[PDB]
């Protein structure tokens, strides 16, 4: 199975990558949080 | 003096007019201002 591994690692390890910016977001939700609650409000009317 | 009463009428108006939209965002004043605080630091960001 080795002798790819150096290819499959980096192959997945750019797919948590791709995901390692939301997953910030995500490790520590809690329900009713006003700094997350009111950030996201900030930056979804920014953009929009 | 009632003649002069049209002029001063009509320039008080327009000046009025012109103070009334800064008074539009200063409808109301609290004490640390929980949320004209976030509001204005959105509009500072946004200009900066």
């Known amino acids: 199975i080795r002798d790819t591994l150096p290819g499959l690692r980096n ?3 750019s797919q948590l990558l791709s995901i390692e910016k939301e997953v910030e ?3 520590n939700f809690r329900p ?3 700094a997350r609650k009111t950030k996201a409000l900030l930056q ?4 929009f």
Chains 1, 2 share one sequence.
């Open 11 to 13: 192959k997945l390890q």
């Open 25 to 27: 977001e995500y490790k």
């Open 32 to 34: 009713d949080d006003p």
């Open 44 to 47: 979804m009317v920014q953009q």
